[PDB]
Every structure is written in C-alpha cells, then in structure tokens.
Design a protein around this nucleic acid. Structure first.
Ligand SMILES: Nc1nc2c(ncn2[C@H]2C[C@H](O)[C@@H](COP(=O)(O)OP(=O)(O)OP(=O)(O)O)O2)c(=O)[nH]1
Ligand SMILES: [Mn+2]
Ligand SMILES: [Mn+2]
Length: 425
DNA sequence: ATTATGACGCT
C-alpha cells in the first residue's frame, strides 16, 4: 500500500519529428508539401529504397524499406526526393543539420537526450515545478492544450472526441495539490505544446510527442496519435492501455526477447505480465530483464533521461550487395578511402562545432555469404583527422581477411568506419 | 538487393 513506489516522480516527454526526412525535403521544395511523397536512397535498383514517407503517401500503403518502383504501383502520383550522393555513397548531412536545428530549440526548454536523428527525450520535472509555482493555483485551460490527447478518455468527429477527453481530464483535475502526478503530467503537456509550437515556428517542422512518467511510456504515448499531435499517458491509464497492448510494441521488446516472453510465458499483451512474480521473470529472462519487466508491466521504469544532445559516435557505412560486392584490392582500398573522406569531413566539422576529438577508429566488414551483419569488427588508434591515414589503417587492420593468392575473397558486402571514444578538445 | 547509421548489453 503506502510503500509501493509507483514511478510517478518524473515528467518525461518523447518528441518525434513527423516523417522527418520528408519534411526537410518539403521545406526545401514547396512543390512537395501536402502531397504523397517519399525520400529514397539511390535510384538504379528498382527506383531506390524508400526511407521516409509522408502521411498522405502512407495512406496508400507506402512504407519504409520498400522499393520506389513498388511504391509507385501502390501510389502512382507518389513524389520522390533523393538523398544526396557524395563520393559514391549516400550523404545524410542535410538531415543531421536539420536535426541540430530542432535539438537546439528543444534544449531551450529542458535537458534533452538525443535518441535518434529525429527524436529526443525531455526531462520536464524541474520545468513543471517552476511552472506550477508560477501559476500559484490557477486552473489549466483547455486552450493551453490545443493538440493534446488524453489516452483512455473519453469514457462513460476526431477533434470532437479529443476535446471531450480533454474536458473530462481537466474537470477531474485537482489544481490545489502541487504534488499530484496527474497535474504534473498536465503542466508537462502544456510545456510540450509550447515546445512544439516553437519548433514549428522556427523550423517549419511538425512533430508528435508523448508525455508520461518515464521514457518507455512517453515513447509509447507519442505513437498513439500521429501526425502533429501529442498524447498524455497517465499512470492511471496503464492497466487498460496495457491490457490489449501487444508485447512487441514496448521499446526493446520488439525483437527476440519479446518473442521469448510471448513463447515462454504463453501470453500476448503487456498487462498479462503482472501475473508473474519478479523472481519468475528473472528466472526466465535474467536478473536485469526480469526486474525491468516486473516494473514495466506496472508502468514503472527508471531509465534516466541522459543529458546528451550530441551523438556518441560518428559513422560511415556502405553495403555492396549482390554482384556489386568488392572482389579486388583496388576496390576495397578505394571505398575505404571514400568512406574515410566523408568521415574526415564530418569529424573536422564536429571538432570545430563541439570541442572534442575522437580517439578510436572502428572498422567493420561483412563478407559475402556470411550469415552475420558484422563478419568482423576491429579497432585501431585514431590520432589525426586524415582520410588517407584512416583508410590505410582500416586496411592494415582488415587485410588478413583476404584469402586470395591482388584479388579479394570472400568478396565484401559491407564496409563501415566509426569514430568513437571522444575526448574534450 | 531495405540502407545508413547509432545506442547499448554480454562476456
Ligand atoms: N538512412 C536511413 N534513415 C532512416 C532509417 N529509418 C529512419 N530513417 C530516417 C528517416 C526518418 O524520417 C527518420 C526518423 O525515423 P522514424 O522511425 O522516427 O520515422 P519518421 O520520422 O520518418 O516518421 P514518423 O516519426 O513515424 O512520423 O530517420 C533507415 O533505416 N535508414
Ligand atoms: Mn519520426
Ligand atoms: Mn523517430
């Protein structure tokens, strides 16, 4: 009863840019705005691989990781923007720079954890406390939440439903208790409306967000109402929400572990997990995963929002699938050089912008017919930002994979250079 | 012949 902590200490938001690469291209080219459109990489093989889809195109069934020529069969009016190509590979620079615009706006409100190029977590606990004090008892007006959904409401036209749910929530609110978790979530959501308005004002980009008490719930909430909307998942909404929530929808359970939870326990939904003791879960899935599952199915997670706006590693990758796999020494060298040249550019810009130097180079390769995604990974020292030296060292470090008697065998289907181990500069 | 990344756990 009084001693079961309920994981309501924090207010955490997950902000995700709606179809981010597509919006970047639509800002740059107005002819694409408010249309079925997608962003592709390469163009020769089946029109190119789609990596981002507007919501208009999604309504036709167009999805990420689909060939453009097939997408065109579903959506013949589909419009396509192409990723920039430099040194024979995809160059994502435009999107990393748009991402930094967004992150820098978010950082004005609260400390953020860059979780990917287009999404960040936000620790709003301090911001909510400050804002609650600033209100000094004033009740929260629906006008302050024009795009917020309250999950699980209403109980007992889409915008009409949204407003009814919000009204039920706000009418039920106890504004005089500065320590009510539900009030804290609500003020968090007001702040998130303000953040999303500033992002759209200053970049043109729209986003969705989730507001809850931890990262996993915030992330799950963000996806409930997209695009251009935000969702508040309260502690109290967890039993009903989780009672039909497939386990695979929870962050980190979408893969093998989630499938084994399903297979070993004989269950389907997150909420069914409540019926197992902590020890049972640890027995099946190990101590860490067991404790984490026991708390997560009750809506409780303690992973902190890390104060980290910048990526921890800077990486350059290219697949050489099918018959394009690299089969000679000259080929492996020339592509290591192309990769090292993009890496040098990104690293020099990173050192100037962010006052830090990488110190370790990681080289990863895949060989043709190898089951694994990394056939090998080896590290060496990264001492100067010189593409010729980094490519020479990556070769020096992988070359004993060749089994030829100037040829290269097994042919290489992936090269990957990653600068890691940053130190302040 | 989804690709290009990037965080993090295990041992
Ligand atoms: N190169 C590459 N980029 C990807 C890949 N997956 C996603 N991206 C890019 C394009 C996306 O806009 C962005 C973030 O991906 P998300 O999963 O958040 O989807 P997206 O933002 O496109 O749409 P949504 O958030 O659902 O509105 O990162 C990928 O596999 N390869
Ligand atoms: Mn997104
Ligand atoms: Mn995202």
């Amino acid at each position: 009863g009084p001693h079961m902590a309920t994981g309501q200490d924090r207010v955490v938001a997950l902000v995700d840019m709606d179809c981010f690469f597509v919006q970047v291209e639509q800002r740059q080219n107005p002819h694409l705005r408010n249309k079925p459109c997608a962003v592709v990489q390469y163009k020769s093989w089946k029109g190119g691989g789609i990596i981002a889809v507007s919501y208009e195109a999604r309504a036709f069934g167009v999805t990420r990781s689909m060939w453009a020529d097939d997408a065109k069969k579903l959506c013949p009016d589909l419009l396509l923007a192409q990723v920039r190509e430099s040194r024979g590979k995809a160059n994502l620079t435009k999107y990393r720079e748009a991402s930094v615009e967004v992150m820098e706006i978010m950082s004005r409100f609260a400390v953020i954890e860059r979780a990917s190029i287009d999404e960040a977590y936000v620790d709003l606990t301090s911001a909510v406390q400050e804002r609650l004090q600033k209100l000094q008892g004033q009740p929260i007006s629906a006008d302050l939440l024009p795009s917020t959904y309250i999950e699980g409401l209403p109980q007992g036209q889409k915008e009409g439903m949204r407003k009814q749910g919000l009204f039920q929530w706000l009418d039920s609110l106890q504004i005089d208790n500065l320590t009510s978790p539900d009030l804290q979530l609500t003020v968090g959501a007001v702040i998130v409306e303000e953040m999303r308005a500033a992002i759209e004002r200053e970049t043109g980009f729209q986003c969705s967000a989730g507001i809850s008490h931890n990262k996993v719930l915030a992330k799950l909430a963000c996806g409930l109402n997209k695009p251009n909307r935000q969702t508040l998942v309260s502690h109290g909404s967890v039993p009903q929400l989780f009672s039909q929530m497939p386990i695979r929808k929870i962050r980190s359970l979408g893969g093998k572990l989630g499938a084994s939870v399903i297979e070993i326990l004989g269950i389907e939904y997150m909420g069914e997990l409540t019926q197992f003791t902590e020890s049972q879960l640890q027995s099946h899935f190990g101590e860490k995963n067991g404790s984490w599952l026991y708390a997560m199915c009750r809506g409780i997670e303690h992973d902190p929002v890390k104060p980290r706006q910048l990526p921890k590693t800077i990486g350059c990758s290219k697949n050489f699938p099918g018959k394009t796999a690299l089969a000679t020494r000259e080929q492996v060298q020339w592509w290591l050089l192309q990769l090292a040249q993009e890496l040098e550019e990104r690293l020099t810009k990173d050192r100037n912008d962010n006052d830090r130097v990488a110190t370790q180079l990681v080289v990863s390769i895949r060989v043709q017919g190898d089951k694994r995604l990394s056939s090998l990974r080896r590290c060496c020292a990264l001492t100067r930002y010189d593409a010729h030296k980094m490519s020479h060292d990556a070769f020096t470090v992988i070359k004993n994979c060749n089994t030829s008697g100037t040829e290269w065998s097994p042919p290489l289907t992936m090269l990957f250079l990653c600068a890691t181990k940053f130190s302040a500069s």
